[PDB]
């Protein structure tokens, strides 16, 4: 889920990491972010950022 | 010595020239149906923010 989430975004505002053998979405650099609200469309993320 | 009127005709034949019917295929179309209008491959964003 943390692609998902990296893909509704300008794509370097989410960078997903590897902290573990699972992996973590992290907000590398909000500046990048262009509002397009796509987040909004998934129905299960929306709730999360 | 005349022409005199015979036996009337016992039956009649109309001749008509006719072809025949070859079997239902119905090709509708070269290229068939309103094939739908639809996405190029990869795109890419052709735009990014300022900072």
């Known amino acids: 889920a943390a692609e998902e ?19 973590v979405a992290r907000v590398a650099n ?5 509002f397009s609200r ?12 | 010595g005349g022409l005199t009127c015979a036996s009337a005709p016992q039956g009649t034949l109309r001749i008509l020239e ?12 070269p290229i068939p149906a309103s094939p739908p209008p639809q996405i190029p491959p990869g795109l890419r964003p052709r ?5």
């Not at chain 1, 989430?5 to 992996?23: A, D, H």
């Not at chain 1, 796509?38 to 950022?49: A, D, G, M, T, W």
């Not at chain 2, 735009?47 to 900072?51: D, E, K, P, Q, V």
């Open chain 1, 30 to 34: 909000p500046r990048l972010d262009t």
């Open chain 2, 47 to 51: 735009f990014c923010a300022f900072g």
């Open chain 1, 38 to 49: 796509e987040i909004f469309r998934n129905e299960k993320l929306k709730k999360v950022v």
């Open chain 2, 18 to 29: 006719g072809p025949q019917q070859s079997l239902s295929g119905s090709p509708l179309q």
């Open chain 1, 5 to 23: 989430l990296s893909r509704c975004f300008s794509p370097g505002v989410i960078e997903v990491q590897e902290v573990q053998g699972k992996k």
